[PDB]
Amino acid sequence: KVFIATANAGKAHDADIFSVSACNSFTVSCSGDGYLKVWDNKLLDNENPKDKSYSHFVHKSGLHHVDVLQAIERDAFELCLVATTSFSGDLLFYRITRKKVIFEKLDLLDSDMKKHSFWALKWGASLSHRLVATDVKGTTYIWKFHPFADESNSLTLNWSPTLELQGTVESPMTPSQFATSVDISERGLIATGFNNGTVQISELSTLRPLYNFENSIRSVKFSPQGSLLAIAHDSNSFGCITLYETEFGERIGSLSVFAHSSWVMSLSFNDSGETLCSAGWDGKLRFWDVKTKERITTLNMHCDDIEIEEDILAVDEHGDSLAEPGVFDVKFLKKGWRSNESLCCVCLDRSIRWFR
């Protein structure tokens, strides 16, 4: 397979772009500058992404994670939610709607929850939608989202959302350590990565530990099937991918040629679960055939890739070259989301890039 550049935005944020997510309607990025940025997916015949972009300030501590949920509520109510976590440990919620794109901050968490310092997060789309998050102390949280507070509000489509804590699962290790990453599968499995190289899988709806196994985990992603778990982890300055069968937790394989000459920062399975994209701090997006565990293609990121020459960022804050900017995050987009499976990544040169 061959992936090609379709659109990009240089100097997209005023600070580092740590995380990116997408739904049918739009890609959303978040940055250490404190802003969310929404990017229309229905972009035109090579039109400037920035002209179809909408920013919203969230928290001056900066944002390090963002995920978007988009569904229709019984052919009636368009539901589009963004969750993002800040460096202060806050976990903020915004409803998104369309003169054009509007952000509405939601008050969902109680006082008890707000004492935690949230890190990683992930929506579990459709009986109600779920959300999962970690905090820095190593605990994972599981909520159920409701667009309507009671049935009277539901019967009138009266927006009044709540978040109901289903419970938590705790960190296996001696003293508890930083939980860097999370995911939730379609089959109902939760996986949590930690900064000591450990990973604990728990059962959703039980919320009880099933098992675990043992340098820091950076990303954790269930394949769409749910039968395989890909894990990015540091290992003596290099970045490694280890695959695990998901039932007993046996390691079944790995991806190499180590996976990246520097850290593997993020993972993203395509829709079929056949391809796996690795985002690397070496500034590479490598794609892996999952079944044969074999590298298929590589995209090398360069600061001079930016279509508008004016917002090429060739040098960082200290004078060091951004010739090959590391990739903070990557996400596969479904077939018909962009204007044929798409992809999006965000890199150290403060750029966001769409492909294929």
Side-chain angles (χ1 to χ4, degrees), residues 166-183:
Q166 294 323 294
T168 60
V169 343
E170 301 239 52
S171 355
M173 64 280 319
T174 43
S176 175
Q177 274 265 49
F178 187 26
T180 63
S181 43
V182 291
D183 200 32

mmCIF file with all atom_site columns, all heavy atoms in Angstrom, residues 166-183:
data_model
loop_
_atom_site.group_PDB
_atom_site.id
_atom_site.type_symbol
_atom_site.label_atom_id
_atom_site.label_alt_id
_atom_site.label_comp_id
_atom_site.label_asym_id
_atom_site.label_entity_id
_atom_site.label_seq_id
_atom_site.pdbx_PDB_ins_code
_atom_site.Cartn_x
_atom_site.Cartn_y
_atom_site.Cartn_z
_atom_site.occupancy
_atom_site.B_iso_or_equiv
_atom_site.pdbx_formal_charge
_atom_site.auth_seq_id
_atom_site.auth_comp_id
_atom_site.auth_asym_id
_atom_site.auth_atom_id
_atom_site.pdbx_PDB_model_num
ATOM 1   N N   . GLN A 1 166 ? -19.264 4.203  36.950 1.00 0.00 ? 166 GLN A N   1
ATOM 2   C CA  . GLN A 1 166 ? -19.467 2.761  37.089 1.00 0.00 ? 166 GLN A CA  1
ATOM 3   C C   . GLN A 1 166 ? -18.509 2.134  38.102 1.00 0.00 ? 166 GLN A C   1
ATOM 4   O O   . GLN A 1 166 ? -18.838 1.121  38.719 1.00 0.00 ? 166 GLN A O   1
ATOM 5   C CB  . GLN A 1 166 ? -19.313 2.055  35.742 1.00 0.00 ? 166 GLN A CB  1
ATOM 6   C CG  . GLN A 1 166 ? -20.389 2.408  34.727 1.00 0.00 ? 166 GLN A CG  1
ATOM 7   C CD  . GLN A 1 166 ? -21.753 2.583  35.364 1.00 0.00 ? 166 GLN A CD  1
ATOM 8   O OE1 . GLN A 1 166 ? -22.325 1.620  35.890 1.00 0.00 ? 166 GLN A OE1 1
ATOM 9   N NE2 . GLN A 1 166 ? -22.274 3.805  35.333 1.00 0.00 ? 166 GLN A NE2 1
ATOM 10  N N   . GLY A 1 167 ? -17.332 2.734  38.263 1.00 0.00 ? 167 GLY A N   1
ATOM 11  C CA  . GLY A 1 167 ? -16.329 2.240  39.193 1.00 0.00 ? 167 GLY A CA  1
ATOM 12  C C   . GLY A 1 167 ? -14.905 2.457  38.720 1.00 0.00 ? 167 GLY A C   1
ATOM 13  O O   . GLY A 1 167 ? -14.663 3.174  37.745 1.00 0.00 ? 167 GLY A O   1
ATOM 14  N N   . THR A 1 168 ? -13.963 1.839  39.427 1.00 0.00 ? 168 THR A N   1
ATOM 15  C CA  . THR A 1 168 ? -12.541 1.945  39.104 1.00 0.00 ? 168 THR A CA  1
ATOM 16  C C   . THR A 1 168 ? -11.829 0.598  39.210 1.00 0.00 ? 168 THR A C   1
ATOM 17  O O   . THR A 1 168 ? -12.351 -0.354 39.789 1.00 0.00 ? 168 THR A O   1
ATOM 18  C CB  . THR A 1 168 ? -11.850 2.948  40.047 1.00 0.00 ? 168 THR A CB  1
ATOM 19  O OG1 . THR A 1 168 ? -11.994 2.516  41.404 1.00 0.00 ? 168 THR A OG1 1
ATOM 20  C CG2 . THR A 1 168 ? -12.530 4.312  40.019 1.00 0.00 ? 168 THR A CG2 1
ATOM 21  N N   . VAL A 1 169 ? -10.640 0.526  38.618 1.00 0.00 ? 169 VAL A N   1
ATOM 22  C CA  . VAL A 1 169 ? -9.740  -0.611 38.811 1.00 0.00 ? 169 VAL A CA  1
ATOM 23  C C   . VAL A 1 169 ? -8.348  -0.080 39.154 1.00 0.00 ? 169 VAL A C   1
ATOM 24  O O   . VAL A 1 169 ? -7.906  0.941  38.623 1.00 0.00 ? 169 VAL A O   1
ATOM 25  C CB  . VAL A 1 169 ? -9.746  -1.618 37.598 1.00 0.00 ? 169 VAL A CB  1
ATOM 26  C CG1 . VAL A 1 169 ? -10.972 -1.413 36.711 1.00 0.00 ? 169 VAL A CG1 1
ATOM 27  C CG2 . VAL A 1 169 ? -8.467  -1.559 36.771 1.00 0.00 ? 169 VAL A CG2 1
ATOM 28  N N   . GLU A 1 170 ? -7.667  -0.778 40.052 1.00 0.00 ? 170 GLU A N   1
ATOM 29  C CA  . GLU A 1 170 ? -6.444  -0.266 40.662 1.00 0.00 ? 170 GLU A CA  1
ATOM 30  C C   . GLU A 1 170 ? -5.177  -0.819 40.039 1.00 0.00 ? 170 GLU A C   1
ATOM 31  O O   . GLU A 1 170 ? -5.216  -1.775 39.266 1.00 0.00 ? 170 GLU A O   1
ATOM 32  C CB  . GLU A 1 170 ? -6.468  -0.572 42.153 1.00 0.00 ? 170 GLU A CB  1
ATOM 33  C CG  . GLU A 1 170 ? -7.662  0.059  42.850 1.00 0.00 ? 170 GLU A CG  1
ATOM 34  C CD  . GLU A 1 170 ? -7.257  1.006  43.949 1.00 0.00 ? 170 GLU A CD  1
ATOM 35  O OE1 . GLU A 1 170 ? -6.431  1.919  43.689 1.00 0.00 ? 170 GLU A OE1 1
ATOM 36  O OE2 . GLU A 1 170 ? -7.765  0.822  45.073 1.00 0.00 ? 170 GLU A OE2 1
ATOM 37  N N   . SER A 1 171 ? -4.053  -0.207 40.405 1.00 0.00 ? 171 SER A N   1
ATOM 38  C CA  . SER A 1 171 ? -2.736  -0.529 39.843 1.00 0.00 ? 171 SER A CA  1
ATOM 39  C C   . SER A 1 171 ? -2.096  -1.736 40.550 1.00 0.00 ? 171 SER A C   1
ATOM 40  O O   . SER A 1 171 ? -1.867  -1.692 41.763 1.00 0.00 ? 171 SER A O   1
ATOM 41  C CB  . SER A 1 171 ? -1.796  0.683  39.940 1.00 0.00 ? 171 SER A CB  1
ATOM 42  O OG  . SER A 1 171 ? -2.472  1.824  40.446 1.00 0.00 ? 171 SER A OG  1
ATOM 43  N N   . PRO A 1 172 ? -1.784  -2.790 39.788 1.00 0.00 ? 172 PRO A N   1
ATOM 44  C CA  . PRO A 1 172 ? -1.215  -4.035 40.335 1.00 0.00 ? 172 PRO A CA  1
ATOM 45  C C   . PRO A 1 172 ? 0.082   -3.907 41.124 1.00 0.00 ? 172 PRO A C   1
ATOM 46  O O   . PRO A 1 172 ? 0.288   -4.678 42.064 1.00 0.00 ? 172 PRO A O   1
ATOM 47  C CB  . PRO A 1 172 ? -0.901  -4.855 39.075 1.00 0.00 ? 172 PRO A CB  1
ATOM 48  C CG  . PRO A 1 172 ? -1.776  -4.334 38.058 1.00 0.00 ? 172 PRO A CG  1
ATOM 49  C CD  . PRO A 1 172 ? -1.954  -2.876 38.323 1.00 0.00 ? 172 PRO A CD  1
ATOM 50  N N   . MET A 1 173 ? 0.941   -2.969 40.730 1.00 0.00 ? 173 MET A N   1
ATOM 51  C CA  . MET A 1 173 ? 2.331   -2.948 41.188 1.00 0.00 ? 173 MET A CA  1
ATOM 52  C C   . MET A 1 173 ? 2.493   -2.405 42.603 1.00 0.00 ? 173 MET A C   1
ATOM 53  O O   . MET A 1 173 ? 1.635   -1.669 43.093 1.00 0.00 ? 173 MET A O   1
ATOM 54  C CB  . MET A 1 173 ? 3.226   -2.165 40.206 1.00 0.00 ? 173 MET A CB  1
ATOM 55  C CG  . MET A 1 173 ? 2.902   -0.671 40.052 1.00 0.00 ? 173 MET A CG  1
ATOM 56  S SD  . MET A 1 173 ? 1.502   -0.261 38.974 1.00 0.00 ? 173 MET A SD  1
ATOM 57  C CE  . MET A 1 173 ? 1.705   -1.373 37.627 1.00 0.00 ? 173 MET A CE  1
ATOM 58  N N   . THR A 1 174 ? 3.613   -2.786 43.225 1.00 0.00 ? 174 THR A N   1
ATOM 59  C CA  . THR A 1 174 ? 3.985   -2.440 44.613 1.00 0.00 ? 174 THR A CA  1
ATOM 60  C C   . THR A 1 174 ? 3.500   -1.030 45.051 1.00 0.00 ? 174 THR A C   1
ATOM 61  O O   . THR A 1 174 ? 2.297   -0.884 45.288 1.00 0.00 ? 174 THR A O   1
ATOM 62  C CB  . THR A 1 174 ? 5.511   -2.660 44.801 1.00 0.00 ? 174 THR A CB  1
ATOM 63  O OG1 . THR A 1 174 ? 6.227   -2.161 43.657 1.00 0.00 ? 174 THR A OG1 1
ATOM 64  C CG2 . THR A 1 174 ? 5.853   -4.149 44.841 1.00 0.00 ? 174 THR A CG2 1
ATOM 65  N N   . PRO A 1 175 ? 4.358   -0.013 45.227 1.00 0.00 ? 175 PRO A N   1
ATOM 66  C CA  . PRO A 1 175 ? 3.866   1.359  45.059 1.00 0.00 ? 175 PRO A CA  1
ATOM 67  C C   . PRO A 1 175 ? 3.271   1.553  43.670 1.00 0.00 ? 175 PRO A C   1
ATOM 68  O O   . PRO A 1 175 ? 3.798   1.023  42.686 1.00 0.00 ? 175 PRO A O   1
ATOM 69  C CB  . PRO A 1 175 ? 5.124   2.215  45.232 1.00 0.00 ? 175 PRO A CB  1
ATOM 70  C CG  . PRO A 1 175 ? 5.961   1.437  46.136 1.00 0.00 ? 175 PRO A CG  1
ATOM 71  C CD  . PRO A 1 175 ? 5.746   0.001  45.732 1.00 0.00 ? 175 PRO A CD  1
ATOM 72  N N   . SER A 1 176 ? 2.184   2.311  43.607 1.00 0.00 ? 176 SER A N   1
ATOM 73  C CA  . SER A 1 176 ? 1.433   2.496  42.375 1.00 0.00 ? 176 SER A CA  1
ATOM 74  C C   . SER A 1 176 ? 2.106   3.585  41.551 1.00 0.00 ? 176 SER A C   1
ATOM 75  O O   . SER A 1 176 ? 2.595   4.581  42.096 1.00 0.00 ? 176 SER A O   1
ATOM 76  C CB  . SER A 1 176 ? -0.013  2.874  42.694 1.00 0.00 ? 176 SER A CB  1
ATOM 77  O OG  . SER A 1 176 ? -0.731  3.180  41.515 1.00 0.00 ? 176 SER A OG  1
ATOM 78  N N   . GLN A 1 177 ? 2.125   3.391  40.236 1.00 0.00 ? 177 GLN A N   1
ATOM 79  C CA  . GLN A 1 177 ? 2.874   4.266  39.348 1.00 0.00 ? 177 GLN A CA  1
ATOM 80  C C   . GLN A 1 177 ? 2.020   4.890  38.235 1.00 0.00 ? 177 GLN A C   1
ATOM 81  O O   . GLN A 1 177 ? 0.914   4.433  37.939 1.00 0.00 ? 177 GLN A O   1
ATOM 82  C CB  . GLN A 1 177 ? 4.043   3.483  38.753 1.00 0.00 ? 177 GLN A CB  1
ATOM 83  C CG  . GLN A 1 177 ? 5.306   3.479  39.615 1.00 0.00 ? 177 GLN A CG  1
ATOM 84  C CD  . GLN A 1 177 ? 6.278   4.575  39.212 1.00 0.00 ? 177 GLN A CD  1
ATOM 85  O OE1 . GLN A 1 177 ? 5.885   5.739  39.072 1.00 0.00 ? 177 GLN A OE1 1
ATOM 86  N NE2 . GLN A 1 177 ? 7.540   4.207  39.005 1.00 0.00 ? 177 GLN A NE2 1
ATOM 87  N N   . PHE A 1 178 ? 2.568   5.953  37.649 1.00 0.00 ? 178 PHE A N   1
ATOM 88  C CA  . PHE A 1 178 ? 1.956   6.723  36.557 1.00 0.00 ? 178 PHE A CA  1
ATOM 89  C C   . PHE A 1 178 ? 1.288   5.831  35.508 1.00 0.00 ? 178 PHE A C   1
ATOM 90  O O   . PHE A 1 178 ? 1.936   4.980  34.914 1.00 0.00 ? 178 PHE A O   1
ATOM 91  C CB  . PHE A 1 178 ? 3.062   7.578  35.914 1.00 0.00 ? 178 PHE A CB  1
ATOM 92  C CG  . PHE A 1 178 ? 2.596   8.568  34.875 1.00 0.00 ? 178 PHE A CG  1
ATOM 93  C CD1 . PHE A 1 178 ? 1.313   9.098  34.873 1.00 0.00 ? 178 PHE A CD1 1
ATOM 94  C CD2 . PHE A 1 178 ? 3.491   8.999  33.900 1.00 0.00 ? 178 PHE A CD2 1
ATOM 95  C CE1 . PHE A 1 178 ? 0.932   10.024 33.909 1.00 0.00 ? 178 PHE A CE1 1
ATOM 96  C CE2 . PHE A 1 178 ? 3.114   9.920  32.936 1.00 0.00 ? 178 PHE A CE2 1
ATOM 97  C CZ  . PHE A 1 178 ? 1.838   10.435 32.938 1.00 0.00 ? 178 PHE A CZ  1
ATOM 98  N N   . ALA A 1 179 ? -0.013  6.017  35.302 1.00 0.00 ? 179 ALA A N   1
ATOM 99  C CA  . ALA A 1 179 ? -0.729  5.309  34.244 1.00 0.00 ? 179 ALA A CA  1
ATOM 100 C C   . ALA A 1 179 ? -0.748  6.182  32.993 1.00 0.00 ? 179 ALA A C   1
ATOM 101 O O   . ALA A 1 179 ? -1.542  7.116  32.897 1.00 0.00 ? 179 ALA A O   1
ATOM 102 C CB  . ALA A 1 179 ? -2.143  4.967  34.681 1.00 0.00 ? 179 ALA A CB  1
ATOM 103 N N   . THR A 1 180 ? 0.129   5.863  32.045 1.00 0.00 ? 180 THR A N   1
ATOM 104 C CA  . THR A 1 180 ? 0.384   6.702  30.869 1.00 0.00 ? 180 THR A CA  1
ATOM 105 C C   . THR A 1 180 ? -0.683  6.620  29.779 1.00 0.00 ? 180 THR A C   1
ATOM 106 O O   . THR A 1 180 ? -0.861  7.564  29.011 1.00 0.00 ? 180 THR A O   1
ATOM 107 C CB  . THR A 1 180 ? 1.720   6.290  30.209 1.00 0.00 ? 180 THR A CB  1
ATOM 108 O OG1 . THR A 1 180 ? 1.626   4.936  29.752 1.00 0.00 ? 180 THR A OG1 1
ATOM 109 C CG2 . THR A 1 180 ? 2.889   6.290  31.203 1.00 0.00 ? 180 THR A CG2 1
ATOM 110 N N   . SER A 1 181 ? -1.357  5.475  29.687 1.00 0.00 ? 181 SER A N   1
ATOM 111 C CA  . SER A 1 181 ? -2.174  5.161  28.520 1.00 0.00 ? 181 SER A CA  1
ATOM 112 C C   . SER A 1 181 ? -3.371  4.267  28.844 1.00 0.00 ? 181 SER A C   1
ATOM 113 O O   . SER A 1 181 ? -3.406  3.601  29.873 1.00 0.00 ? 181 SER A O   1
ATOM 114 C CB  . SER A 1 181 ? -1.301  4.492  27.459 1.00 0.00 ? 181 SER A CB  1
ATOM 115 O OG  . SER A 1 181 ? -0.439  3.531  28.044 1.00 0.00 ? 181 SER A OG  1
ATOM 116 N N   . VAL A 1 182 ? -4.350  4.280  27.943 1.00 0.00 ? 182 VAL A N   1
ATOM 117 C CA  . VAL A 1 182 ? -5.580  3.511  28.078 1.00 0.00 ? 182 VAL A CA  1
ATOM 118 C C   . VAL A 1 182 ? -6.254  3.229  26.756 1.00 0.00 ? 182 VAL A C   1
ATOM 119 O O   . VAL A 1 182 ? -6.085  3.959  25.784 1.00 0.00 ? 182 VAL A O   1
ATOM 120 C CB  . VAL A 1 182 ? -6.654  4.240  28.902 1.00 0.00 ? 182 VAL A CB  1
ATOM 121 C CG1 . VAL A 1 182 ? -6.243  4.329  30.299 1.00 0.00 ? 182 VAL A CG1 1
ATOM 122 C CG2 . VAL A 1 182 ? -6.975  5.624  28.334 1.00 0.00 ? 182 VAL A CG2 1
ATOM 123 N N   . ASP A 1 183 ? -7.060  2.177  26.758 1.00 0.00 ? 183 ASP A N   1
ATOM 124 C CA  . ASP A 1 183 ? -7.960  1.878  25.650 1.00 0.00 ? 183 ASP A CA  1
ATOM 125 C C   . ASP A 1 183 ? -9.118  1.019  26.125 1.00 0.00 ? 183 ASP A C   1
ATOM 126 O O   . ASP A 1 183 ? -9.066  0.414  27.194 1.00 0.00 ? 183 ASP A O   1
ATOM 127 C CB  . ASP A 1 183 ? -7.219  1.171  24.518 1.00 0.00 ? 183 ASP A CB  1
ATOM 128 C CG  . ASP A 1 183 ? -7.947  1.269  23.182 1.00 0.00 ? 183 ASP A CG  1
ATOM 129 O OD1 . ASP A 1 183 ? -8.630  2.283  22.925 1.00 0.00 ? 183 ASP A OD1 1
ATOM 130 O OD2 . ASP A 1 183 ? -7.885  0.376  22.314 1.00 0.00 ? 183 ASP A OD2 1
#
